[PDB]
Amino acid sequence: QNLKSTDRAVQQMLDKAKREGIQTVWDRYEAMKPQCGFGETGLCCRHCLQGPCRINPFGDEPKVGICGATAEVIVARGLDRSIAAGAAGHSGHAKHLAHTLKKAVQGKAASYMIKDRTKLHSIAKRLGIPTEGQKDEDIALEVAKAALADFHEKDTPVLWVTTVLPPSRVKVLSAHGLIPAGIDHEIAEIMHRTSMGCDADAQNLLLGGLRCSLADLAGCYMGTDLADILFGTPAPVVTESNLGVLKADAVNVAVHGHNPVLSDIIVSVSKEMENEARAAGATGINVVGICCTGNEVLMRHGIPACTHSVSQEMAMITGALDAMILDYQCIQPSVATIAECTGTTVITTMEMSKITGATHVNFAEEAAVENAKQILRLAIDTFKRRKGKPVEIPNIKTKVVAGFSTEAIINALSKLNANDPLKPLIDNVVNGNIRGVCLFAGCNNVKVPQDQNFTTIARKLLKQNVLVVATGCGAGALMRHGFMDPANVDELCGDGLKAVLTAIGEANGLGGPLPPVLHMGSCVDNSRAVALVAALANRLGVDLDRLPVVASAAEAMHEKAVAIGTWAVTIGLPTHIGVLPPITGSLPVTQILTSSVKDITGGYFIVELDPETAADKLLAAINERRAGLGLPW
Amino acid sequence: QNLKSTDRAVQQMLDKAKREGIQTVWDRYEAMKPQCGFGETGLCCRHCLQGPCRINPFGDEPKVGICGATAEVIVARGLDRSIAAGAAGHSGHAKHLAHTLKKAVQGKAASYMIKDRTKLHSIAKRLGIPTEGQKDEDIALEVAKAALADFHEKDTPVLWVTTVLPPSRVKVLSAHGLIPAGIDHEIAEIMHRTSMGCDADAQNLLLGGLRCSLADLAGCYMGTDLADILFGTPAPVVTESNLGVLKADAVNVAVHGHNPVLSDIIVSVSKEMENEARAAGATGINVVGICCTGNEVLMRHGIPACTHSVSQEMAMITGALDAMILDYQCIQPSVATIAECTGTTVITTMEMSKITGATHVNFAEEAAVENAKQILRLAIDTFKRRKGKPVEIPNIKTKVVAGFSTEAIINALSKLNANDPLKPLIDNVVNGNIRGVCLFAGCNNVKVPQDQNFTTIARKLLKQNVLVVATGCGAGALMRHGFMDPANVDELCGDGLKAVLTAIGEANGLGGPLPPVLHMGSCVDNSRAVALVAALANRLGVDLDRLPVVASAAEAMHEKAVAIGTWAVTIGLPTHIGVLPPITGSLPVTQILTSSVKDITGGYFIVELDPETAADKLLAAINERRAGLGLPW
């Protein structure tokens, strides 16, 4: 099972699944081998009914699409559509939050409110929305309207791009025509330009992709902004992770998907229903997180993380998961079928994300508490139905310190320098105690033994004094392997990095260091990493493509991860991807993405499947940046 | 060559291409065989980096996607993305026209103006925009703003759906949640819901598809509305079609793509440059049309159609095509390479639609005349470079009577009944002189011998007294085979239909019938057919799903054709498709699309590759509708 997942709790559940004849993602992957080499290389096109078209990577015919589409066009069109799809997910999420905020302040959704007034005001100020002598509700209404306005063309470009990146960066991007006009506008334009008989120049197509990736960035940043206003900006919190956070004597409820609009209410209502749960013979309702929405409630409330990404089915295999409450994105639809074997009640809540065989309970923001109670009562009923049934919860969990929003990080640093909080970080970059910064982001992928890339690369970087920050299922991987436990600083961290983590931790009253890796939150909260890096850029008076900062989507899966990787490149970062995106069938496209894009944005992809080699390449990228700033490395 | 195209001019050019070693779409198709059966059936998914996934249509593993996505989910997601892509094209086109109208009336694009004031006012009235005591420029500004507003969420749904279909139809669609909230909104929502781990219920996914198809309808209708305001509502016009419309002694300039914003100016400026062209040794500039933008200028100005869709390369093979002026959509990128052999100057004009190797001349509406002149001067230079070179223009063309906008049709009918113009049409439906109405729409497809389905089905329906209307490359097929020549009425038409065409024609001063098939314009002008059918529905006090009206995308290719077929189904029409869309890998999806959707919208797909059988099925559909209305059949 170690060949499938490096997580021992997951290995234990794989054995149980095998024993019980429950097919898993790894089994479905095995059944899929060998996968289609045209698809793998990107040399397939189904954009019209003359297809499917393919191009032999090497050899003889077919060499070109039926319409004349070259390998470089077909590869760039496929990639662009993946970016658009990612953008559509992150921005759909953000749009949902924008409508919820609007409803809240118009009196239509009393379960929601402005929880972070300071965040609201700072966002308003960043957007140019006056606050002076204005009601919070009116400021919030204006912020919500601005959010919604960024989805379409108007007299300004997308403000959730132009107001969050330094002017110098916006200038470089504007010069290449890369600033998005509107989020859904760009998504639609990608789908148009990649449809048959339209855009057929690789460079032109890829530039459209870069621009659509910035529309994804805007959706991410908007999502984080709005979730913070509504639900609170995260601060350091201590919790736990892995399957051992499930409790046989509790009603175990997983929140799974992405949007805190749902999970946040689940969390608060679950506390209100403790006595009902105990009436049913449970100790209480034990809310646990899966995927991003688990990250959202972990960051804000310390809700323990059950599992992530590829291993999500394993939570069910325990026999103790009474409910899995879904909104959208990254939910393996297998869960609806597995539920029949495991007894878990899988509940969908969003009109556009249903799964055949799951129970659908519409969740309206206007009736959030009522709908939450309905959902949680299904969970309590399920708990009762497993009275007397043995469960197998692996007794495996890690301690997780998380909640490192950019505000939280700035606050932590301010204990070392009150009026110049970034300076201690920069001081230690300059003196070599911090070599650079690496953001781990994105998914697990069944092709990579689960977590192997994240942990292998993180271990090498931490020993080389890289400050490691993490989001999404990257943060999930690292938390499950102990990288968010400060007790592991001595083992994992180089002396320089240890010194800094310890210094900041001791200044914050901990008597101990910050954790080895800083959990910056969900995938939309990759925007937090952008906020930090942009604040560092502004403080140094240089652009992001001069900073010793890199990203690694070390086990990427979702179209969202492709969009995130692409905007990381577009904002100026060397960006590692540890799975093959479908680009290798075109050398020219690969060359643009891994090399010539440096001349456009300063960032570039690093495609490297071997994690030890990936680490070396990321370190080289970091050190090149150090050299560029005249620093020793 | 008859196995490739039924068009003799195309056959002649195929022989020339073969002789000269110029690879064509048919050669690239042959080189692609056998095509991938997973793609053909829809049983392939590349929506994440765990893929590519496939499902054996029959047999053993793989039976399910890696994430657990079933055949029915994978098929419905693929289809939905095609609908979104189609919607993105038609609506991008419409958006372009909306911005042009806005610029025109704000004084920023003096080459454009309100040409059809009556159309402007009627659209304003339909949208609820007051005109009483308003300047045309201000009304137009409000119409342009309303157009742009339909792309995003607002306090009203998409008005270019809700104001163009009868209330009863809007009610049925609203009841199923099918009315689009915003055009780009829906496009984005499709891309989201079809991304990994989101929507995973075939019925739910397909309903999203139906709704996105109505967003495509809105883009089509908006495009037609705006093009009419800007460039004039078509009226009956006589012209010619096929390769024989090229002239060895003229500068031959093809307008190819979709948007009249470009081609309309090309047409007017070309007339202004006659003396320059003659200075270069040409008789003049001979503008000819390819694809929809050719249809636009044919409908409004009588510009002859050179060719369409699959055979577009053949115009170049003549040796006489001096320029091919492109905007976007349906342009085989092969043209850029073929140009090198044929001498043709291929010119792209839109930022989001470039082709490697083509000359790009940016076309700004603000500088339309200047940019048009630059483009046409490249054409004149090219004409000069072929002085003394033999050309082979097949001496093959047909007479085409076209320009049958819905207003034109209503006007024609009004000569028989001034104050109830639809009544003569309905009278003849009731008495059996007109059996029903069939709209031919959409593309040619290299898989079908070019035009074979259109002409085979049209011939059978016309003999059975079906009133045949046509748009896009369906209209192209039929025009090239003589179906738009009134001299062919005796040969093609049943006695009943002949009687009616003759009656209307003689009432309109022709001394002869209307043509066998009524050309209703470009693909966005499928919206004109909707206007006619909706006016008939309103006049009869019944919904569209009770009318003896069917559609046939007999040789469909583009994602746009899939979107159009899907909205034809959604508005209540039996809708034939003569190529296999990638749905056969899921029986449940096929069953929904061909059967159970009847219970939702009253329309349904008829998938039938055999054109004689397709004709029989369309006739059966028509006659079933007749029976439903209590009429003999």
Ligand code: SF4
């Ligand atoms: S768009 Fe071109 S390459 Fe793609 S399926 Fe159609 S003919 Fe083939």
Ligand code: SF4
């Ligand atoms: S979304 Fe599911 S079926 Fe599609 S490629 Fe990814 S794992 Fe395979």
Ligand code: FES
């Ligand atoms: S030929 Fe396998 S992905 Fe299309």
Ligand code: FES
């Ligand atoms: S396996 Fe051929 S279309 Fe994907």
Ligand SMILES: [Fe+2]
């Ligand atoms: Fe996520």
Ligand SMILES: [Fe+2]
């Ligand atoms: Fe078209």
